[PDB]
Amino acid sequence: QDSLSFGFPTFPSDQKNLIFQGDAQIKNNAVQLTKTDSNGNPVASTVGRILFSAQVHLWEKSSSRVANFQSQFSFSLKSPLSNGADGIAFFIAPPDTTIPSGSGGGLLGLFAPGTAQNTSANQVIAVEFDTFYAQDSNTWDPNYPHIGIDVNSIRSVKTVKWDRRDGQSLNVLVTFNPSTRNLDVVATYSDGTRYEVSYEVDVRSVLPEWVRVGFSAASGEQYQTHTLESWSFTSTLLYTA
Amino acid sequence: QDSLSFGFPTFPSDQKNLIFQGDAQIKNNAVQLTKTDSNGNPVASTVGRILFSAQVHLWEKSSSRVANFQSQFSFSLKSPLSNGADGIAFFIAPPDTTIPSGSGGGLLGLFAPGTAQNTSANQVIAVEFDTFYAQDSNTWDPNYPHIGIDVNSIRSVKTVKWDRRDGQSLNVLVTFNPSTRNLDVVATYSDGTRYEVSYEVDVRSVLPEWVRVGFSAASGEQYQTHTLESWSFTSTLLYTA
Numbered sequence: 001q002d003s004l005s006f007g008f009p010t011f012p013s014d015q016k017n018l019i020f021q022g023d024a025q026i027k028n029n030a031v032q033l034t035k036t037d038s039n040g041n042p043v044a045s046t047v048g049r050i051l052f053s054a055q056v057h058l059w060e061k062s063s064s065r066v067a068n069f070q071s072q073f074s075f076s077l078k079s080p081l082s083n084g085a086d087g088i089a090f091f092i093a094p095p096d097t098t099i100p101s102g103s104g105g106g107l108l109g110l111f112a113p114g115t116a117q118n119t120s121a122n123q124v125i126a127v128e129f130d131t132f133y134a135q136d137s138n139t140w141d142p143n144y145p146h147i148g149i150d151v152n153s154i155r156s157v158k159t160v161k162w163d164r165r166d167g168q169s170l171n172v173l174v175t176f177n178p179s180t181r182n183l184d185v186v187a188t189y190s191d192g193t194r195y196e197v198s199y200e201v202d203v204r205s206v207l208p209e210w211v212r213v214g215f216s217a218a219s220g221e222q223y224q225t226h227t228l229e230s231w232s233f234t235s236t237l238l239y240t241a
Numbered sequence: 242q243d244s245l246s247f248g249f250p251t252f253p254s255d256q257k258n259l260i261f262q263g264d265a266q267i268k269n270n271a272v273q274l275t276k277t278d279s280n281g282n283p284v285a286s287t288v289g290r291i292l293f294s295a296q297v298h299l300w301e302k303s304s305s306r307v308a309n310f311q312s313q314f315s316f317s318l319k320s321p322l323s324n325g326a327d328g329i330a331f332f333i334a335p336p337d338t339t340i341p342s343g344s345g346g347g348l349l350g351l352f353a354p355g356t357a358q359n360t361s362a363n364q365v366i367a368v369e370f371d372t373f374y375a376q377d378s379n380t381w382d383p384n385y386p387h388i389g390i391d392v393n394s395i396r397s398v399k400t401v402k403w404d405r406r407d408g409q410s411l412n413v414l415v416t417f418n419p420s421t422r423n424l425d426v427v428a429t430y431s432d433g434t435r436y437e438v439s440y441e442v443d444v445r446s447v448l449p450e451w452v453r454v455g456f457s458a459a460s461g462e463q464y465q466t467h468t469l470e471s472w473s474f475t476s477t478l479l480y481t482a
């Protein structure tokens with residue numbers, strides 16, 4: 001299809017079009033990307049991701065068209081610790097993507113340790129909400145919590161300082177305009193606190209024509225819940241001239 | 242997802258979200274439901290269907306909601322014969338639906354001979370454009386080409402006279418309003434000739450909560466091509482009160 005849209009105001013337990021990977025699962029009308037105990041508390045060493053089953057036609061070589069897309073979602077992070085880790089990310093990747101071996105902790109379940117910073121060995125665009133930046137284990141991170149745009153590397157091409165608020169939902173809008181090639185990210189808390197980060201990228205040189213979209217999250221030694229509360233997505237192929 | 246939408250203005254050969262069954266395949270940017278030889282001419286004894294891969298949430302028992310949906314599509318039929326057969330149908334059925342054994346010809350690839358008219362043995366709602374009505378083989382049909390609404394039986398709950406026009410595209414809009422429980426069908430030819438038929442049906446008592454949607458066509462002894470040219474579909478769960 002030239003156009004595709006879907007919306008999950010909430011996540012009922014009965015799902016048919018979601019691909020669950022790792023520890024991801026539905027809990028109380030929300031997607032818990034990372035594992036939690038029976039009490040609902042976060043645990044260490046866990047990775048989980050979800051992808052929508054239908055493939056998205058990002059670009060078409062034969063017609064010279066590139067899709068514009070918009071992804072709106074909200075999530076909350078909760079943790080008994082003040083330094084919860086590791087973060088959640090919205091990502092776009094080839095349809096057969098699976099959790100890379102050893103991609104836990106700071107790699108957010110998106111990159112393999114050996115090639116995490118090799119831009120020619122990966123095919124992924126992600127928007128990360130990174131809460132852990134210890135320079136001993138996350139050597140690629142700026143020294144503060146941040147939102148980042150990742151293009152084939154865990155080392156963000158662009159970041160903006162961000163504030164982690166335990167238990168508060170963050171509303172996010174990610175948009176891509178093929179006319180300008182700008183990938184824009186706008187995140188806001190209910191009180192109006194806003195964060196913005198943008199980057200120009202030619203999706204045609206990074207990802208294949210058909211892709212799958214979803215979310216990934218992980219916790220290494222430090223932990224926190226990564227709760228996806230709602231998600232809507234829309235994409236439409238347009239003539240880029 | 243509570244809401245799902247997709248649009249195929251045309252059907253390029255590179256498809257990823259369509260389930261092809263029987264002889265259905267893409268040719269010349271359109272879906273040829275029934276088999277055609279090397280010259281593109283229709284052949285006898287063929288059946289084919291396509292379904293969109295993502296499942297549609299038709300209704301939700303826990304929230305008492307039912308989907309409002311709209312399916313817009315266009316197709317054309319062509320045959321050297323004076324009596325092209327057998328017809329094409331838009332249908333909604335359980336996710337695991339497959340072509341029934343012996344469902345060829347007048348059964349349109351939707352029903353099995355033994356239970357074709359047994360309503361308690363089927364789970365399918367379809368809108369058929371039936372061009373073959375020989376009273377000796379298709380005993381259930383009115384004696385003329387027609388548009389019919391089928392609910393768990395090949396014997397339409399309702400039919401309206403229709404004119405088959407060789408090589409001309411018919412644009413169809415099928416809508417379901419959960420408030421009134423009305424399934425409306427409006428079809429038009431490019432010269433403004435219009436056909437309308439409506440039926441009140443509670444989809445909750447006919448189909449499961451999750452279903453797949455698609456098209457089916459067949460040709461028995463007599464034949465014609467059944468070409469699906471475009472298709473857009475949208476569904477959204479709504480409160481019924």
Ligand SMILES: OC[C@H]1O[C@H](OC[C@H]2O[C@H](O)[C@@H](O)[C@@H](O[C@H]3O[C@H](CO)[C@@H](O)[C@H](O)[C@@H]3O)[C@@H]2O)[C@@H](O)[C@@H](O)[C@@H]1O
Nearest residue numbers: 324326327345346347348373375377378460461462463
């Ligand atoms: O695809 C059409 C039809 O094919 C299969 O039925 C086989 C034949 O069954 C009967 O003999 C007739 O209906 C015949 O139709 C011809 O004869 C009719 C009466 O002489 C005439 O009205 C028709 O126009 C035609 O010339 C069928 O060919 C079987 O697969 C059916 O399900 C299917 O609908």
Ligand SMILES: [Ca+2]
Nearest residue numbers: 106130132138
């Ligand atoms: Ca980090």
Ligand SMILES: [Ca+2]
Nearest residue numbers: 347371373379
């Ligand atoms: Ca018939």
Ligand SMILES: [Mn+2]
Nearest residue numbers: 130141148156
């Ligand atoms: Mn980071």
Ligand SMILES: [Mn+2]
Nearest residue numbers: 371382389397
């Ligand atoms: Mn009929």
